[PDB]
Design a protein around this ligand. Sequence first.
Ligand SMILES: Nc1ncnc2c1ncn2[C@@H]1O[C@H](CSCC[C@H](N)C(=O)O)[C@@H](O)[C@H]1O
Ligand SMILES: Nc1ncnc2c1ncn2[C@@H]1O[C@H](CSCC[C@H](N)C(=O)O)[C@@H](O)[C@H]1O
Lengths: 317, 317, 319, 319
Amino acid sequence: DSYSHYGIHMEMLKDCHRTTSYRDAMWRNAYLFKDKVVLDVGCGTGILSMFAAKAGARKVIGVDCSTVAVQAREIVKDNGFEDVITIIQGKVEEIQLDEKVDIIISEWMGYFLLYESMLNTVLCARDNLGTPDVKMFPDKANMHVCGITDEQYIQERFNIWDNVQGIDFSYFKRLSFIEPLVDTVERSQIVTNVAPLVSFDINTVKEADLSFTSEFALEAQASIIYVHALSVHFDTPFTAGHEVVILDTTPYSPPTHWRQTVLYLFNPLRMRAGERATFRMKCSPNALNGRDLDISLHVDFEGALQISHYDQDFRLR
Amino acid sequence: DSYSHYGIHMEMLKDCHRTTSYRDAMWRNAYLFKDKVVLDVGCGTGILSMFAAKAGARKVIGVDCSTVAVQAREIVKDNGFEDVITIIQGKVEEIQLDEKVDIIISEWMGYFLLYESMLNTVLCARDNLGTPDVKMFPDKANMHVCGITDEQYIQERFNIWDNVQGIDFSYFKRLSFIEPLVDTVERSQIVTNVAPLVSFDINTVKEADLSFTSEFALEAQASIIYVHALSVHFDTPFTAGHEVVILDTTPYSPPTHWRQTVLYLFNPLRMRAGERATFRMKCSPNALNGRDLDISLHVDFEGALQISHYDQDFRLR
Amino acid sequence: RISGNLSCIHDRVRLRAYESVLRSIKGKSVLHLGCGMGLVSMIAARSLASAVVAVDRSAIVDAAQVVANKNGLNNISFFRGALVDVVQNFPVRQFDVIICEWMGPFLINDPLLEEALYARNNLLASNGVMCPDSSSIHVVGVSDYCFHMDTVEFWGNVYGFKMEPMKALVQREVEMCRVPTSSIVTTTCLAHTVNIASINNLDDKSSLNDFVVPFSVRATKDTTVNFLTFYIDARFTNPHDPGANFVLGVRPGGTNPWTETSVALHEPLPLKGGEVLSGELKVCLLNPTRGITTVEVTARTSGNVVNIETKGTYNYQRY
Amino acid sequence: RISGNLSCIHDRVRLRAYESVLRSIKGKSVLHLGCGMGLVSMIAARSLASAVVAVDRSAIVDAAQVVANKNGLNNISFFRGALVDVVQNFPVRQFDVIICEWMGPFLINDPLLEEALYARNNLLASNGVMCPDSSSIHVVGVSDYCFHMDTVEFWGNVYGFKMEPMKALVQREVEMCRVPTSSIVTTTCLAHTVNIASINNLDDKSSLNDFVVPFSVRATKDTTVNFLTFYIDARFTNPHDPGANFVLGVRPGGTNPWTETSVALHEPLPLKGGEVLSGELKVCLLNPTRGITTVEVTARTSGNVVNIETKGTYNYQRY
Ligand SMILES: Nc1ncnc2c1ncn2[C@@H]1O[C@H](CSCC[C@H](N)C(=O)O)[C@@H](O)[C@H]1O
Ligand SMILES: Nc1ncnc2c1ncn2[C@@H]1O[C@H](CSCC[C@H](N)C(=O)O)[C@@H](O)[C@H]1O
């Protein structure tokens, strides 16, 4: 309900790549919207509903359980879409519509793609509100991972707790490893190939599939190569249309407001160019808190400089 | 009359510095506009009239002699300024208003500040249409000049005519020196201090003052420095208000659509850091052809490598 | 959660201030309300304080307790939750020193104040002191045309669509954000002061500390003020220990103990150098527990450029 | 005005072509309409042609005459103004070779054609030739979503204001501008051809050369065509001297003898690779002297992605 404040909506709208990705996904495939019913799951200020209307949609339904719906309804009216866009204030799970919707647009992605994400809501809408062939915008979500060197934050965010005014706060250091960091990873930090973490087809994925296992390998590239953390990013291709548009949060692109998610390894990997390290990651919703993420990470690395096979856990809360 | 076509208006509107200079000049001095009558001489698309309206003007009057005024009248209505902005289609010289206007805004500047400029139209509006204390936007105009090296164009625009397919086109080379070049001068070319060419107070200047004489000196700065040409630019300060804004076409700022005017010297000046070359420029509208500019230039340079006292004529047509 | 406490360990100003207070703390009991990570709480315990009861609502105190246990500190106990819900479990219930930063962005609207007053009336010994004990609010004029353009006019057009309704949401909100020095264009004016011994209780009515005070600043240069910014300072004056006094001072444009709050003036105020910007600040606390506050501001020029007066009501919330 | 002739001296394609024609010109008379700077004219005069009469409206001919006089070429004479206004003073009025690029961006909309036809009917010898004698127009589908965004959607909001009325002015204007190779996404269709010997006169009516021709291209890849682009070529075939023939060919995305023109389709046409984009091109000359032209296009997909047909009228002017 913090979306009733203007700061978050401004941040998202000033995220040019994000908003233009949705816009161009619809406008480069406007033929897909002619005479169609569009559901904007979490319409916020209404921006995506208006992109859909401007793309040629017959009817757009922006739903948002925040008070921003009020402002959205007014914005929709101020630009002449009053008779095309309808703004409902309420939860998408607790609302019912006249027709089944042909297209579902939504910026459901959270940090790490799934933390505090509305994906469960979008899937609920897809199943209960969407036609059997309802088209998803985006309809694909791919998470990728790569190793990074981060001497700066290892010294300023972890080792800083070793001594604080002559007191040992090592316990704070150990607790820092549990919580991933949402921040921007610079290209210069990537010391590893980007490997596929996991892929979801939003047309077919089920909530149970979001609790995923992934086995990926990371190869050191370009003389001691330190993998201090794993940078996790995602992209959401809009493959529903003839022209493919891809929203990308990769560090190789300018930062979005999702930036990147950094899982700091309890034991950094000391690799050399060409050596490979295997990883097994399990992500699942937190048992007690539904919207928190438990991440289990198995690191198996054997190289000329280190041999480490350990299990580490993270909790995004 | 080519302003009935969209290209020129897009060029000017996509000129961010020009448009935001007028925008800010008004919105940082909105107190000057409250309950005031504004005249937008040459409103074009109406952009400046709407800036004035948002600044709080009681009444704005945009005049334009081209067909664009039709679109302007529709634009002002599309944004709700119908009851504040009135769009007149016609020459400002040939129209008369009920009240005397308190403020006159206009982008009258051309290449070289005065080539095909509406300055005479603005002075006519200042005298006949505005109150005795009418405020000008911009109310000042300042031209500056500096010497530049341009070996590239000296070889591709002048010396290339020496022999063309076995034919001596040297006459074309001699004629090329008559025609100023409207192009972007990069900082790399400036080998001279920016000197004041001439200044105009739009509150008091008369048409006779626009046929101006200027005596300016140019000093080389930082091998042998060639002054192949003189780069002339201008700036129009908005000093009518408490907050001063300055529209600037200097080559030390990103290019505007005015770029810079390059007067190529028939005899380049061979200088080195410190040496001083004096110039006397007389700019006046061509006796017969009114809207073409005749530029007489007397170059007097005495240095260790050259001694030249010559007169050159340029025709901006 | 751990990263959120880094700002505390790098807060050199607070550390030297509360260190000056914790000199004479040996043998005295300490109640630390809003202890956070408990750094000052543990420093007090390390200063051989008889007993240290540290309270906060965030889970960090649990980690703080662990750290305390792992450092040999045996005279300190942490409690998670609101004071009212933990006093019943308190080992001791009369304290000689009560450390609590009860001052909000407008002096009276920090939810911790409700707890400080409880500690003042029930948990403070007869000769006990409270730290800090006073807080003043300072007003300055700010000129940031580009910020207004990027937060207000930005909604004029968003990818081709007008979002005028959002402008209201921007101008009705008190902005807590560091303001650059280049945007400070007036002198500073101390408008009001509150002292914990005089602050009225809020259990019956939340308005018993609301105040209306004038202010006046002088433009440091020809400018146009379109924001008013409010800085909070804190003072601790101990008559029994005069040397242990401190001041968490205010320096607009620089590092301050609290992030200043700003309000956007609905009509900019153009000023000449030296011209007086006069005004009035009205602060009303509506909900002590959530810090819900209304801030009514009147501000005017002196007429050198133009006579303008502008009013505005702004809303601040802690929780 | 002098700089405008640099393109000519660097145009090696035209240069070697017309040189091939001016080999056998010794002893023959030449009329160069639209001579510009007169480079080809002087190359013909230097080839010991009996007489060379070069005409053009721009003052550059005066400069050209100076050059000709300073290079010893006395068998050449330049005339400024419209052909009809200068034939009165021509030394000879029957020519063996008439060089004139009479072809416009749509084959029939160049004002110089009105002079070419006059020369064909009055100033051409019995066995004289006209160079070039044929011209064809080629159609290609173009995909440039960003150009549409920058030129049409740009007016969606300009500094906070909506300038919708301008969008129309953009989409009804034939744009003359080179199209990048990356935006060429279909084959090339030679849609129409005109020969100077077959072109009808324009003195009475201006519509005697308007043409309506079909076109069909195949998408080179999955794409969405939102622009149609038109390229012009020229050909000279001399039956008496077959070896001197030439072709001012065309290559979309690369250098060409004329800058292509483009029209913005009002509805994009999504195509799969290899899909056929079919359509119809209608060109109408309204004002020969000013080259005012209307260009109507119908363009449709084959349905592999979606059946869409779009139509549009566009305006072109020379002067
Ligand atoms: N379960 C739920 N049902 C309906 N709306 C929800 C929801 N959970 C979150 N939301 C709303 O969905 C929005 C997602 S963020 C809004 C993004 C917006 N489309 C833009 O691009 O600017 C939030 O404003 C929130 O209020
Ligand atoms: N003598 C004259 N009287 C009235 N209008 C004139 C004029 N000379 C030129 N104009 C008009 O003035 C305009 C100047 S350019 C328009 C700039 C406009 N303010 C903008 O920022 O978009 C042209 O559109 C032209 O049509």
